[PDB]
Write a protein that binds this ligand. Structure first.
Ligand SMILES: Nc1ncnc2c1ncn2[C@@H]1O[C@H](COP(=O)(O)OP(=O)(O)O)[C@@H](O)[C@H]1O
Ligand SMILES: Nc1ncnc2c1ncn2[C@@H]1O[C@H](COP(=O)(O)OP(=O)(O)O)[C@@H](O)[C@H]1O
Lengths: 261, 131
């Protein structure tokens, strides 16, 4: 099946871009700027805009973080990509901010966030997805609850936007944002590559190598001056591969009254 | 109103006047300082405490402390609205007797706070593991 692809870290930080290699476009007759339909796990769905990029391999697809959380998939998994040319201009859009992102704004969100982000963008959206808007000092997420036609539509100047109502409370399987990922680490490319080399395999697929039989690593020492961000590296790795990061502090084990340490 | 005198500080309160309430003391007026002393108004406002005028020779340091402390204490709501990390600790180090406790007390009294003092030796000598 020469349609599926494995997700990978991207460079373009826009919410509606994907990076495919030119042989993939030649094989699938993919142009630039078309609308493609992306299928993933949990029967989730989203749409995006194809952009050219030669850095990624042919079998590899580059995509940002917001779409990755939209599809409920982690890096290293498989998604299905196809051209989706039946999409047409939307009519009305109903958006509602999330509860734990707008604590203390109380202003016209339409003129502040939505108007610049949706300006001359032609961003296609699908009902039920979440997208993040940069702003003044914080980041605000909006979950599109209604669009016409459903489920697909394209932003046009003469579209109705409603930005009024009680903000929707957080979901459960939403994979809450603001958790540190791989974009929050800079200037540590080589060491992060070394760490990812020996930890990805025993954490993503746990049974295969054990069946083969090898000695997986059982301890990694991160040493350096304080403030360089080692806890950040550990938390990012844990939150990306998928694990149960359980920090135990140093002094907290020493402050206990002897016996119970 | 507080009047300076012989050796202490004496503060007086007016209970009534004519015409009321506004008036200007004139050379031709009748005063009476006869009567039992009244008690505190019960809203504190004690002028015998410390302020910014009781510290001298530390203008730059007081300016720095005011710069880095006034906003988190006076306006908490706006600060938590902006969403930026506030300072969590300040060290004052110097020779003993230069008046660090005075600076802390002055800031706490003037900006409005709940100054709570923790001694070192008092905590240290509290017996067993109850410290
Ligand atoms: N790319 C980065 N590299 C190093 N430090 C970072 C980076 N991004 C953020 N930080 C800072 O590192 C801090 C967390 O590091 P910290 O847990 O204190 O490491 P350590 O505890 O080992 O000193 C964060 O407050 C953040 O401001
Ligand atoms: N403007 C001033 N600058 C420094 N010290 C002062 C000033 N005014 C008064 N003092 C004296 O400094 C003393 C501070 O005592 P103390 O709390 O022991 O200082 P520290 O704790 O800094 O050693 C007060 O008893 C006060 O008499």
């Amino acid at each position: 099946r020469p349609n599926r692809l494995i997700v990978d870290e991207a460079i373009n930080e826009d919410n509606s871009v994907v990076s495919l290699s030119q042989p993939k476009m030649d094989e699938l007759q993919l142009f630039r700027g078309d609308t493609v339909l992306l299928k993933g796990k949990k029967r989730r769905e989203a749409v995006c805009i194809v952009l050219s990029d030669d850095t990624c391999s042919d079998e590899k697809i580059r995509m940002n973080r917001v779409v990755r959380n939209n599809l409920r998939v982690r890096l290293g998994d498989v998604i299905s990509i196809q051209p989706c040319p039946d999409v047409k201009y939307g009519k009305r859009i109903h958006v509602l901010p999330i509860d734990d992102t707008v604590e203390g704004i109380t202003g016209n969100l339409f003129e502040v966030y939505l108007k610049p982000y949706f300006l001359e963008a032609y961003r296609p959206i699908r009902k039920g997805d979440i997208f993040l808007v940069r702003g003044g000092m914080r980041a605000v997420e909006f979950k599109v609850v209604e669009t016409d036609p459903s489920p697909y539509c394209i932003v046009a100047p003469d579209t109705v936007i409603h930005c009024e109502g009680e903000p929707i409370k957080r979901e459960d399987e939403e994979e809450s944002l603001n958790e540190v990922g791989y974009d929050d680490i800079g200037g540590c490319r080589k060491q992060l590559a070394q760490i990812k080399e020996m930890v990805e395999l025993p954490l993503r697929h746990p049974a295969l190598f054990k069946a083969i039989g090898v000695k997986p690593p059982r301890g990694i020492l991160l040493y350096g001056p304080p403030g360089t961000g080692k806890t950040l590296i550990a938390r990012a790795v844990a939150n990306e591969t998928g694990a149960f990061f359980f920090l135990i502090n140093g002094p907290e084990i020493m402050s206990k009254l002897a016996g119970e340490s």
